[PDB]
Design a protein around this ligand. Structure first.
Ligand SMILES: COc1ccc2c(Oc3ccc(NC(=O)c4c(C)n(C[C@@H](C)O)n(-c5ccccc5)c4=O)cc3F)ccnc2c1
Length: 281
């Protein structure tokens, strides 16, 4: 990959400068890979400050980026993400624009990987309170994203990260038909309200500790399934009030679905009635 960086806009390069990091502070370990491949090509990285203090990071290589339009789009995404600041939203440490090799994205290292794999791992023992707690953290992250008028589009357990303090970081914001709202499947439109539907599916994943949704329904038969008024069944470990929350999230009419603000207050109330946790945040 040899991108001709000279062909970029002065005001945009000026705009992205506060997001750019490079070899004077970032060490990429190109021989050391992170993850399976559901986050793409990711390397272990080390970020140093002025006094040489090291920080563990993940370095994603965007290998499919070739032309100047795609790089410009990449810079703008970097600019947007860098501005976000919320404990339940994954941070952007920076990006790398290099004359040789693909553009790079630098994120804080997430000890416990993604939430779906964490809860599926049988060596972990999350309580019902633990699972609801994870769901509350996601809702708080989505409440922030909504307040910035930013639509996630791909909310799911696989896309939520978990750090060493068991803080959930909403990630990969900005085909998973089984997470898509009815209107998104039909009109291809995505909004914060459709993010609320996906969040309902995410809660279902949590309470089933990462079971695949709609097991007996084909991906192409999902639109008719939902128009028939059929929904995901109540998980064995899901309480009645949380299941009603899920049902509200999957309302036929997008405008009738709760806001993430409403979701945080309701899930917070349910969470408070539960006791016993093995993962305290
Ligand atoms: C130990 O196991 C793992 C396994 C995987 C890990 C990991 O994977 C990633 C998670 C998330 C992302 N990236 C994102 O969530 C991005 C978001 C949300 N945006 C922003 C959006 C507006 O496009 N961008 C982006 C930023 C700048 C330019 C273009 C795109 C992004 O890369 C990249 C990763 F490797 C990150 C950190 N620790 C990990 C530990």
């Amino acid at each position: 990959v040899h991108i001709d960086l000279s062909a970029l806009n002065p005001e945009l390069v000026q705009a992205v400068q506060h997001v750019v990091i490079g070899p004077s502070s970032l060490i990429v370990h190109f021989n050391e890979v992170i993850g399976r491949g559901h986050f793409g090509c990711v390397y272990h990285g080390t970020l140093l400050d002025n006094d040489g203090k090291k920080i563990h990071c993940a370095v994603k290589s965007l290998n499919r980026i070739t032309d100047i339009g795609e790089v410009s789009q990449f810079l703008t995404e970097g600019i947007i993400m860098k501005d976000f600041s919320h404990p339940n939203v994954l941070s952007l440490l920076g990006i790398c624009l290099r004359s040789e090799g693909s553009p790079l994205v630098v994120l804080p290292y997430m000890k416990h990987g993604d939430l779906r794999n964490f809860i599926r791992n049988e060596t972990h023992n999350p309580t019902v309170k633990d699972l609801i707690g994870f769901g509350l953290q996601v809702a708080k992250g989505m409440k922030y994203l909504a307040s910035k008028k930013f639509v996630h589009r791909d909310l799911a357990a696989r896309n939520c990260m978990l750090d060493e303090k068991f803080t959930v970081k909403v990630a990969d914001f900005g085909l998973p038909v089984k997470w898509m709202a009815l209107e998104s499947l039909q009109t291809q439109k995505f909004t914060t309200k459709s993010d609320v539907w996906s969040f309902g599916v995410l809660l279902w994943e949590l309470m089933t500790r990462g079971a695949p949704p709609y097991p007996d329904v084909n991906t192409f038969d999902i639109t008719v399934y939902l128009l028939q008024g059929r929904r995901l069944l109540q998980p064995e470990y899901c309480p009645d009030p949380l299941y009603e929350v899920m049902l509200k999230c999957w309302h036929p009419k997008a405008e009738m679905r709760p806001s993430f603000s409403e979701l945080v207050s309701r899930i917070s109330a349910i969470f408070s009635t539960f006791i016993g946790e093995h993962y305290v945040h």
